[PDB]
Amino acid sequence: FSFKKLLDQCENQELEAPGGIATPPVYGQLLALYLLHNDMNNARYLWKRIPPAIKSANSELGGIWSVGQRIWQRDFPGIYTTINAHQWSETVQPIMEALRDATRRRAFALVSQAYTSIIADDFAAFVGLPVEEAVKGILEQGWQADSTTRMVLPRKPEQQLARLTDYVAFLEN
Amino acid sequence: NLLEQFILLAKGTSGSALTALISQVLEAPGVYVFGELLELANVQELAEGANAAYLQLLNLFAYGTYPDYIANKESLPELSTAQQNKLKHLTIVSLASRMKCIPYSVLLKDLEMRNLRELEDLIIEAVYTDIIQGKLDQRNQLLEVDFCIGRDIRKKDINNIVKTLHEWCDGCEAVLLGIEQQVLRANQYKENHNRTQQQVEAEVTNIKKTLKA
Amino acid sequence: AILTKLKCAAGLAELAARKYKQAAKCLLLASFDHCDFPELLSPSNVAIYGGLCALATFDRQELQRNVISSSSFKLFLELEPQVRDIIFKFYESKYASCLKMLDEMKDNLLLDMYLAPHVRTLYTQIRNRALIQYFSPYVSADMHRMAAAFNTTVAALEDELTQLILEGLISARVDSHSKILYARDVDQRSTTFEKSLLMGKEFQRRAKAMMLRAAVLRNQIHVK
Amino acid sequence: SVSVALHPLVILNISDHWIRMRSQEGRPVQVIGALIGKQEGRNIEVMNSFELLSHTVEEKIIIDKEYYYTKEEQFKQVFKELEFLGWYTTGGPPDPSDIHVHKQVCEIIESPLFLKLNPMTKHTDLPVSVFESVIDIINGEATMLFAELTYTLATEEAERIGVDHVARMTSTVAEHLIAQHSAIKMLHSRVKLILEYVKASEAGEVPFNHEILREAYALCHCLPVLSTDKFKTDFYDQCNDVGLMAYLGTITKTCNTMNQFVNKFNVLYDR
Amino acid sequence: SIDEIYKYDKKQQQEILAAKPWTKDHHYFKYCKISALALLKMVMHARSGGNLEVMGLMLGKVDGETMIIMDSFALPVETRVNAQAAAYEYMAAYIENAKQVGRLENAIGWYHSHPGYGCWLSGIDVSTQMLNQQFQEPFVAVVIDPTRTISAGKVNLGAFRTYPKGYKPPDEGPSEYQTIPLNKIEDFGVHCKQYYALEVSYFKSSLDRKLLELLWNKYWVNTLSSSSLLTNADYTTGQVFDLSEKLEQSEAQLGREDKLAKATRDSCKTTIEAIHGLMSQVIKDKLFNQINI
Amino acid sequence: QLQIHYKVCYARVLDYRRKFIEAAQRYNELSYKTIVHESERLEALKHALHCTILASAGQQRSRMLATLFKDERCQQLAAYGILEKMYLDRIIRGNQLQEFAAMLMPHQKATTADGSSILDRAVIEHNLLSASKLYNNITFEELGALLEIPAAKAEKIASQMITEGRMNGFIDQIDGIVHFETREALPTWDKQIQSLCFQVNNLLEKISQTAPEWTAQAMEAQMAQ
Amino acid sequence: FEKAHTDFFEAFKNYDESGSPRRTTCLKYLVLANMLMKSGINPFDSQEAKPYKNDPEILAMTNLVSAYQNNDITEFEKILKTNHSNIMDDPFIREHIEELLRNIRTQVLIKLIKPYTRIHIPFISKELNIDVADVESLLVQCILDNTIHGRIDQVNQLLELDHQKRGGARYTALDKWTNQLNSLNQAVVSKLA
Amino acid sequence: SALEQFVNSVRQLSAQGQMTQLCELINKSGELLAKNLSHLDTVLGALDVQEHSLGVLAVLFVKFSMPSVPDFETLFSQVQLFISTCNGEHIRYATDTFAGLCHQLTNALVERKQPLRGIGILKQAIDKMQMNTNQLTSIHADLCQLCLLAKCFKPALPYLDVDMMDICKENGAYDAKHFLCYYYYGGMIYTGLKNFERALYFYEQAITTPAMAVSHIMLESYKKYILVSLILLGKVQQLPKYTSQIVGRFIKPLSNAYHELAQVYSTNNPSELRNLVNKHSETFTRDNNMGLVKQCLSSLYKKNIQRLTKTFLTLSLQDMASRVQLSGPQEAEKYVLHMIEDGEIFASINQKDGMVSFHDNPEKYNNPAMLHNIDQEMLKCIELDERLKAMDQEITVNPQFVQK
Ligand SMILES: N#Cc1ccc([C@H]2[C@@H](O)CCCc3cncn32)c(-c2ccccc2)c1
Numbered sequence A: 001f002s003f004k005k006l007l008d009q010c011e012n013q014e015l016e017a018p019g020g021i022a023t024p025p026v027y028g029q030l031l032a033l034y035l036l037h038n039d040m041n042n043a044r045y046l047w048k049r050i051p052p053a054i055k056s057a058n059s060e061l062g063g064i065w066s067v068g069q070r071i072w073q074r075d076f077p078g079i080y081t082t083i084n085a086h087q088w089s090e091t092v093q094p095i096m097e098a099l100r101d102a103t104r105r106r107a108f109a110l111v112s113q114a115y116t117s118i119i120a121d122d123f124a125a126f127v128g129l130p131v132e133e134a135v136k137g138i139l140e141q142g143w144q145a146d147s148t149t150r151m152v153l154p155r156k157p158e159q160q161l162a163r164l165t166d167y168v169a170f171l172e173n
Numbered sequence B: 001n002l003l004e005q006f007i008l009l010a011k012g013t014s015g016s017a018l019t020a021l022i023s024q025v026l027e028a029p030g031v032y033v034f035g036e037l038l039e040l041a042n043v044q045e046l047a048e049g050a051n052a053a054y055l056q057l058l059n060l061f062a063y064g065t066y067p068d069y070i071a072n073k074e075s076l077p078e079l080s081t082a083q084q085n086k087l088k089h090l091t092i093v094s095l096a097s098r099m100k101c102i103p104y105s106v107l108l109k110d111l112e113m114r115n116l117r118e119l120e121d122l123i124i125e126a127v128y129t130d131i132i133q134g135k136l137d138q139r140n141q142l143l144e145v146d147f148c149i150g151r152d153i154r155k156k157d158i159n160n161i162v163k164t165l166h167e168w169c170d171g172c173e174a175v176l177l178g179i180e181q182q183v184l185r186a187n188q189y190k191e192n193h194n195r196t197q198q199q200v201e202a203e204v205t206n207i208k209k210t211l212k213a
Numbered sequence C: 001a002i003l004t005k006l007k008c009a010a011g012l013a014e015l016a017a018r019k020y021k022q023a024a025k026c027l028l029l030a031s032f033d034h035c036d037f038p039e040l041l042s043p044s045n046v047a048i049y050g051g052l053c054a055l056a057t058f059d060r061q062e063l064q065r066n067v068i069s070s071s072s073f074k075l076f077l078e079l080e081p082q083v084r085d086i087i088f089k090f091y092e093s094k095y096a097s098c099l100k101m102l103d104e105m106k107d108n109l110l111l112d113m114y115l116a117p118h119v120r121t122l123y124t125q126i127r128n129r130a131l132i133q134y135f136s137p138y139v140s141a142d143m144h145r146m147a148a149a150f151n152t153t154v155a156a157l158e159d160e161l162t163q164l165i166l167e168g169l170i171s172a173r174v175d176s177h178s179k180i181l182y183a184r185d186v187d188q189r190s191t192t193f194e195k196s197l198l199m200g201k202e203f204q205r206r207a208k209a210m211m212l213r214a215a216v217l218r219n220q221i222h223v224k
Numbered sequence D: 001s002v003s004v005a006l007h008p009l010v011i012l013n014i015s016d017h018w019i020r021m022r023s024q025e026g027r028p029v030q031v032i033g034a035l036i037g038k039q040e041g042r043n044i045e046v047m048n049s050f051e052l053l054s055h056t057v058e059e060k061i062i063i064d065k066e067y068y069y070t071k072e073e074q075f076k077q078v079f080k081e082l083e084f085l086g087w088y089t090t091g092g093p094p095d096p097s098d099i100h101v102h103k104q105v106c107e108i109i110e111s112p113l114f115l116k117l118n119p120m121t122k123h124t125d126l127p128v129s130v131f132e133s134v135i136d137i138i139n140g141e142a143t144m145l146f147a148e149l150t151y152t153l154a155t156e157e158a159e160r161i162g163v164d165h166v167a168r169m170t171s172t173v174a175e176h177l178i179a180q181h182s183a184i185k186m187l188h189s190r191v192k193l194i195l196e197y198v199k200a201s202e203a204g205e206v207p208f209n210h211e212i213l214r215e216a217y218a219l220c221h222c223l224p225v226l227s228t229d230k231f232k233t234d235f236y237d238q239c240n241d242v243g244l245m246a247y248l249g250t251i252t253k254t255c256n257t258m259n260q261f262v263n264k265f266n267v268l269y270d271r
Numbered sequence E: 001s002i003d004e005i006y007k008y009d010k011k012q013q014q015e016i017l018a019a020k021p022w023t024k025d026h027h028y029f030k031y032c033k034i035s036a037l038a039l040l041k042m043v044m045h046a047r048s049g050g051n052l053e054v055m056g057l058m059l060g061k062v063d064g065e066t067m068i069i070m071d072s073f074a075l076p077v078e079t080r081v082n083a084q085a086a087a088y089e090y091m092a093a094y095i096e097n098a099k100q101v102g103r104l105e106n107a108i109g110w111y112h113s114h115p116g117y118g119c120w121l122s123g124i125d126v127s128t129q130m131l132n133q134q135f136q137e138p139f140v141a142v143v144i145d146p147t148r149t150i151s152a153g154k155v156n157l158g159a160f161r162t163y164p165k166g167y168k169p170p171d172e173g174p175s176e177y178q179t180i181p182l183n184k185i186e187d188f189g190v191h192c193k194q195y196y197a198l199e200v201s202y203f204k205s206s207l208d209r210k211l212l213e214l215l216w217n218k219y220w221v222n223t224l225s226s227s228s229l230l231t232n233a234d235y236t237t238g239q240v241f242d243l244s245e246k247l248e249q250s251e252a253q254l255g256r257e258d259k260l261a262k263a264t265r266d267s268c269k270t271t272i273e274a275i276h277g278l279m280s281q282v283i284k285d286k287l288f289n290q291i292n293i
Numbered sequence F: 001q002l003q004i005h006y007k008v009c010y011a012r013v014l015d016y017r018r019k020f021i022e023a024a025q026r027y028n029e030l031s032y033k034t035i036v037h038e039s040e041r042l043e044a045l046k047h048a049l050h051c052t053i054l055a056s057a058g059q060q061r062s063r064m065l066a067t068l069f070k071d072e073r074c075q076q077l078a079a080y081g082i083l084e085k086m087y088l089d090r091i092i093r094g095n096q097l098q099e100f101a102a103m104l105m106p107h108q109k110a111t112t113a114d115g116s117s118i119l120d121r122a123v124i125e126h127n128l129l130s131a132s133k134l135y136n137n138i139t140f141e142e143l144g145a146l147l148e149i150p151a152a153k154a155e156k157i158a159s160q161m162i163t164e165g166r167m168n169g170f171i172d173q174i175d176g177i178v179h180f181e182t183r184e185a186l187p188t189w190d191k192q193i194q195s196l197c198f199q200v201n202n203l204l205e206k207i208s209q210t211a212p213e214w215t216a217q218a219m220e221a222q223m224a225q
Numbered sequence G: 001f002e003k004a005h006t007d008f009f010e011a012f013k014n015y016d017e018s019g020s021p022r023r024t025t026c027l028k029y030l031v032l033a034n035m036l037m038k039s040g041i042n043p044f045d046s047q048e049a050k051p052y053k054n055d056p057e058i059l060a061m062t063n064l065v066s067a068y069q070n071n072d073i074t075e076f077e078k079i080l081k082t083n084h085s086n087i088m089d090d091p092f093i094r095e096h097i098e099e100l101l102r103n104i105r106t107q108v109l110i111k112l113i114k115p116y117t118r119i120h121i122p123f124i125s126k127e128l129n130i131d132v133a134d135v136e137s138l139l140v141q142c143i144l145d146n147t148i149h150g151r152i153d154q155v156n157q158l159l160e161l162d163h164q165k166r167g168g169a170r171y172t173a174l175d176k177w178t179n180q181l182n183s184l185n186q187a188v189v190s191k192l193a
Numbered sequence H: 001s002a003l004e005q006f007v008n009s010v011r012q013l014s015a016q017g018q019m020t021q022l023c024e025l026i027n028k029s030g031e032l033l034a035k036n037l038s039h040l041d042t043v044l045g046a047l048d049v050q051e052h053s054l055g056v057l058a059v060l061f062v063k064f065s066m067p068s069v070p071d072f073e074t075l076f077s078q079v080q081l082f083i084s085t086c087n088g089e090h091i092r093y094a095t096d097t098f099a100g101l102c103h104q105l106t107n108a109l110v111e112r113k114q115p116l117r118g119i120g121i122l123k124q125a126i127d128k129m130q131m132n133t134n135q136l137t138s139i140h141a142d143l144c145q146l147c148l149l150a151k152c153f154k155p156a157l158p159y160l161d162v163d164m165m166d167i168c169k170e171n172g173a174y175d176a177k178h179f180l181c182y183y184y185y186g187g188m189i190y191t192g193l194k195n196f197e198r199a200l201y202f203y204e205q206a207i208t209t210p211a212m213a214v215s216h217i218m219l220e221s222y223k224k225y226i227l228v229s230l231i232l233l234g235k236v237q238q239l240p241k242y243t244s245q246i247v248g249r250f251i252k253p254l255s256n257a258y259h260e261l262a263q264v265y266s267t268n269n270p271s272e273l274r275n276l277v278n279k280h281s282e283t284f285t286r287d288n289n290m291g292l293v294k295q296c297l298s299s300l301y302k303k304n305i306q307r308l309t310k311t312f313l314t315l316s317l318q319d320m321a322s323r324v325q326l327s328g329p330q331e332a333e334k335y336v337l338h339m340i341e342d343g344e345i346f347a348s349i350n351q352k353d354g355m356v357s358f359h360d361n362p363e364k365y366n367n368p369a370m371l372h373n374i375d376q377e378m379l380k381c382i383e384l385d386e387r388l389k390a391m392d393q394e395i396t397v398n399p400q401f402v403q404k
């Protein structure tokens, strides 16, 4: 829940903006949180609205935007590749290692709900894990992975009386 | 009654006659509750002696089930076929007390039954003795029990009766309170609507009478 | 001889007007004995026109009542055995032979100056009605013995009954993996709920729009 | 043995018959009549009744059979699917005279029922009592005896509404949740008294009744009532049907209000 | 005591009938008292007919400006003015048998059912009642709606007395609203001014009072174990069909006396009945389905 | 003797002529004759009861079954087990029916008389109605095992009896399932609520009579005051 | 077929005072046209048929009529097989034999599908004594004529019969209400043009 | 000095009531010509914190020549403080000058290219001037324009998600430019957030406005409405019957590239649509709504795939790509996967044999969640009816309505 509060605080701080321009750490945190919450429209608009001078003086924003571009193209291998290509002073890392976990859960849910059968290599690329790791991990949920054909088989996952009295009171006046 | 007849035959008997009468009670069809005979001090005095197992056997037919006898077959006296059938009927009743849709697998495992025909024959037997009333769903492999008799209760099982009845009374009180509150709210809504309508009409009449000047 | 001539003239006029059902209805009531029109219609042409138009537009009950179990028209179909065979094979659910004879007589029908403009659409309607009548008794067809019951192949069959389903004439779904035409009937409760919720959504949207319009007209907002 | 379902209309018939005769002759007299209904398998359902003409000769009541047959044809004209089920009278426990009248009624149908009402009663439950006739061989003699049957009150929705209307003798939400309130009050009082008896037996103020507490435990086991998944699906089906009906009614009401507002707007602002 | 009404005074009845004050006053009869037994009898007879109209007679007596019904019996009668003329023999035989078994009260009116379309007098009912007040005077016409009795949980009953041909009453047009279907709205509108509705009250004796009080001790089960949404289900669909037709007519009027308001009233009635049924179901679920461990 | 000797001969002739229900009625009538030598009344009652085989299912026979069931003297008869199951609509197994047939007599034991045995067919159709009250649905080779007939014969009999209106249900041949009455969820909910409230009423009534006044009326006054 | 039946009856009753060897043929034609309409129900029970039906010049025809009214496929085809040389020999009888058989196979089949909700087509083939191709043809013809209310699963080769009737009258009413609300709601809003 | 006497009279009128006299005295401008205008700006805020110093800031911002102030820094600071502490209803007496000051600030920020710097100011000015949230002011258009030029679309969302029931008159003023600007800019803000359902509504309300001339905002809103309707729906939604005849007589001919795009869109040919886009690429980029035209190109493919669900129970990837003109089973599979993820389709992918399988809607209305949804719709309808009844009752008590 701290991620939502940090996002709100960063948005408010960028709105305060003594000069219209926020500090580059706040820009990076806001972009990382936008990527984390899978909100790509606001992330892209933040990228366009970041001044070019801030971009040139802060090369980290390029890495966060490369990860965002990978997310925009729905390129999960690219997402995992670009996430593990950058580091900073533990203000974007907590919200970017948490981005990887959210991306992995998203990929798992997408494969579960979209595929009745997916190749082991494709599933491993989706979850960003080694093939044998991905196949072994689906053990207690029963995904019926098969050898030789290398085909996985994803599995799909009061006050009512007051309301009714309100409805009748409305209808009868 | 049938159990009351056996109690009158155990007023003074003790020893081997008591065990013979206990076996007759457990075998005679139609009697599926044994608490009145179990509470007798004469019967309870069997807890010490050679016939103690017999008393425990009665405690199996009043509070225990068939799996409780399978695990203690050596300790208990060798049951007759009729007594085993009665114990299976009581196990069906006990299962029906906690769930109203008993899977066939649970009945097969608990009653140590061989196949589906034998189990359903036993269930039909239990229905014909009026201790349970329900229907057999072969396709879904269920026994939907509509009614079942109340088995015997220990002195520690009366607390559950009090708990359930207290919860039911609290639910009834809450429902009545909600009904009264909803009646009050509906009446308030109706009176407020009528008051606002009459106030609007009065304002319109005042404006109309002012417009005539 | 006078009523028959009027019926034939009306049927021909409504055939030229591309109203095939009425043309069939007027040409079916003609009498064989009173049919001698060297300037209007030959008896064979009456049979061909009536049979083709009825096969195109009449449903099963009407076709049986008016063409198959009518003693007046039986004489006309005696002149043209091919049309009678086509009609009776359509009724008896023998579509391969019926469509084969229709295709065989297509060339001769295209030289008829009064039916040639209508041959294409009449054949299209006949084939569509045959396709509808084939799947009517089936909850699950085979798309085989069906691509054979018609002249086409399985792929051309998918092309045909995809547009038939899209047009709403056949309420079905084609499974292209196993190549089977399944019948989907309705989910009446779900459709009712969906349509009611959609109506409520549009009602709320246009009520908000009308409230904004009332605010606009109240303040006399306009572009000058 | 049979299972009897009794309609309250029969009870009202008998009570009105007794009241009319008592008012007509000044003193309370015993009334005799017929009970009709439907028998399906072992289930008897008594749903109507009509008065029977009886003559007291010497010290014995004889049922006029000709009048019974004319009335049987009369009620066959209107109730085409109702059959003669038995007879009814008023009084206390079944008297020896009731045996005589039941023997007379047995000449009409094979196994009649016998209803008895107690207009002058002291207990707090319904004085209706139903019996069936049995023949017992005692000391080498065939004697008629009455075996009491257990009856339930047959439910018809119109009958329930009429009985509630004639028993109560008096916002739509408030009027609706007063019929619910009374039944819930009765259920709550009964459950509370049962709970108090159980608590008294537990701590110890009344003799330990094994049977009563066994029935109490069975009653506790009867809850919840039909908590299966199919029941939940059906319940939410009904809830959603009523919700869609409410949504459509609300849309209609809002359309009417919007029409009134549009009319007023067009009148005020000249359009 | 409440048993005074059940005592029949033949001499007083003959004197009142000889006096016949109702031939002078035109709105003489203002009240209709119906016994509990008679009301129940007509209710069961009306419900037993299903969707088909049923009719019977009801016996009673006049007291002051009140018509009192003691009992009611069905008629084998099954459009037709004075349809009881086809069952005169049944009426006479029933009257004779009733007099044999101590039913000293003579015929006071006729009742018939209006399944699902309100309690009023149609054109045929007005003619029948007008003929009845010429010969069988005094006479009152009771109309029962069993389907709406089920749906609303309230006895839908109405006693009416017509006006003679050639008499215009002093308006009396408050017109308490009643949902009349689109097919029966024209007859109701045409003939609404040719009759007036008596005030209906009910009574019971001491024995009926005691028996109902004791029967309620075991009759509360049926109140708490009944579903209204399932019994009067086909009635609601017919009401929705009629309401949609009314909405169509109201929209046509909008395109052109405020049919939209009447359609809204009908929709509100139907929807309120449905929500009442749902409230009963929710109460039952709370009482019996929420005692789980 | 007088005229009862004629009645016995008449009932015997009615038995021979296959006049089942009339013979049962006559035998029941002379079973109550006081002037007979006691045990002969038991023989007349047994002969009246032995019209479970000689009988056509309907209304006149069901009333006779009820009359015999309400007899305390029928408990001494070996056919009582057949009677109680036939009146209460219970499954009659093979051994008990075979014993009943064994204690019959050759003319009552009409070998074919319709094709298969006339009594065995009636028992099979009786066990199939009685199985429709214990099962929501039953497969073949289980209904056939229950009635001790081949699965094909069980399906044929059930199908023939469904069309003739004698029983409600339908057959699914693909799964081999006979489906009996449906018993939908909400009417069952109402019935179970009514049964639970009946239990509440019965418990209240029983408490008020094993402890009259005392706790019963004391607590009734306590809650109402 | 009705007028043919009456004409043949009149010919049979009027041909007694003339040529002998064409009296039985007219009776055969009369009973053929009687059972061809499948509604005559006029077996040899008629009193005027005593002189020429009691005498067994023809007997297989009486059994054929009895089987036709009894809807017995086995008996009908047995009389057509064992009792030869007096039924199939007539060219007039033969051309209506196949119409007669299909008349009874339809009536047996209607009775067979009544208790079922899903019935195998090989089962119907064994019951009607006709192979599965003509079983499916007869089912298609019956379903098209609204005679049988069911549908053929061709891949599994089984007839599914419409037995469940969910309450749809409520949903049609709700749909009409929704459509009227959709039309009325627009009409109200357009008044504020 | 005149300024001292005017300040004294302003202070006297404040806290003494009679706000009409105060507004009349402030309306007596033209004496604020002295360039000491800042000395009296901080001598009156002690009591009745800010109702004065609003015409002062107005005349400061309408000085024509750039606020001499450092860039304007100082004037911006005073205006921000004024908006922060103008204590609500005091400035509502003169609400045309408040909106005018907001317009001046918005124009100054737009000219110097820092709109975000004033995005948060207008949020304070909107809710401190409107009577309720359902009241459209002229600062709504300014806020939308600032949130549009400086691409921060989220601050404007609370001011766009509320449906407007009343429109502020603002002592005259409030031309139709503010209404059209607000609805056009809200439509473009929703379009950027891909809320096409509400963007279409906003665009429609822009075109619906009564008009006797041709507005540039009206034409742009119509042209974007066509595209948004082609994206959200498969066709161009029919405009309301009450739209002014100007849009169908001038704006429709002036928008022919978009009508041709809709016409070629009605035929389900992606190649034809791409050819049309390349043909009119000059007008789509000049109108600056290119990339929304490409969204129509992308949505045509989704429309084609959504049509396969109405005919096919199961299809291959290869022949699906053939049907929708995707040229490859892999692209078809990626399209299906994206549509499944977005919820636009109910389908499954089986690459053992390369098959898409189209399912029905799993929503059967037998769950408490649908009960909650229907209750939410019921509540919205009930509040709609309550608003309609309130307006009805307020019209009824109007003396003008009673007189006629
Ligand atoms: N006396 C008189 C009488 C008059 C009318 C009717 C019927 C009849 O007209 C048909 C429908 C219209 C209608 C409304 N109320 C009654 N009716 C009937 C009637 C009553 C029950 C059964 C058959 C006829 C009797």
Ligand SMILES: [Zn+2]
Pocket (backbone or CB within 6 Å): E112, E113, E114, E120, E121, E122, E125, E143
């Ligand atoms: Zn009427």
